[PDB]
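Write out structure tokens for maltodextrin-binding protein.
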Amino acid sequence: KIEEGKLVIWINGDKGYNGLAEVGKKFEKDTGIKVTVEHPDKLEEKFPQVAATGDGPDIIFWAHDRFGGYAQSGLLAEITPDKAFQDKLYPFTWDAVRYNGKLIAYPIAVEALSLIYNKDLLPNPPKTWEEIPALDKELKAKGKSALMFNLQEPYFTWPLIAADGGYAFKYENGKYDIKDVGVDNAGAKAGLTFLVDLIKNKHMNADTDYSIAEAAFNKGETAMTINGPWAWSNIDTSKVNYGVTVLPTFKGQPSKPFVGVLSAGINAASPNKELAKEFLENYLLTDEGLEAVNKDKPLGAVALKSYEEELAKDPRIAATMENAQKGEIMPNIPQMSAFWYAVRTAVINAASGRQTVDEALKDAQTRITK
Ligand SMILES: OC[C@H]1O[C@H](O[C@H]2[C@H](O)[C@@H](O)[C@@H](O)O[C@@H]2CO)[C@H](O)[C@@H](O)[C@@H]1O
């Protein structure tokens, strides 16, 4: 059973659900329609379950890459924002919400990795990756290191590998070509080679992971790290006078980190599709709406141009958006799973010696296009 005459929305417990409830209240005040916001555990797993029997919430909020599987099963309705409404959000955000050409959700916020540096020991962060080997040598003369970041997860090393030419799946005409994979090209090898060279020359350690790199930076042992907005609070506590800026370039090309877009989708079984569109387009996605949510829990950078211009007064937020625009929207298709597993293995093998760069990426490329 559906509901009709009301809206039930689902959003994770780590987002600003009280603020979203407040926009829901204004909605009821204006139109008279009731809006109920819920935040159940493991909601991203429950949705495909209940939605399959024609039940669940009218609207669901979650990273866009999850909507791919939902769209595949016909769980999400096709949205119809006109050209004028689409012009209100940054163009690249609409690419993260289409499946097989159809628009299946509204972009809300944008997230991506940035370069984080310690202002006290490094007032002027490097503009290029090539500069780092030398910067590390000067800093070591005082018992400090230049950079430390997670080398165990491919999500963190990919920005560098992608810089000069690497890509997961080719995107064109709003579609991904599962046959045009770019982890085996010249650019990718140049990027990984530079990464392996860093470890051989003793600038980084092949075993460094998330906790290890985070501690080094927060203790002031290393001058920089690479992380996302989910890590700022831990830095605030450490008391390090930190900065968040654009990632370094490689061979003159910007680093290209994967982008995650918080999005709002409409249950295909909902009899309240027009109510959902009214609420999402003219209440939530306004300076007033996103403001309400942001106050409760910060959204980071947002897709709405007008509000993003206001939030950008914060240099950390301005950085997140700059790195995201220079990055690669994470693919929402089934094969991306193969990509992750194949690339993880290659990076770890080339870093440990288990395999050379040329061979590691060659095998990865072979497994993914299988
Ligand atoms: O390393 C592969 C891994 O990358 C992504 O995970 C990110 C996530 O997107 C970020 O929001 C944050 O949590 O850091 C994660 C890396 O630990 C993909 O989302 C994930 O599916 C993939 O396995």
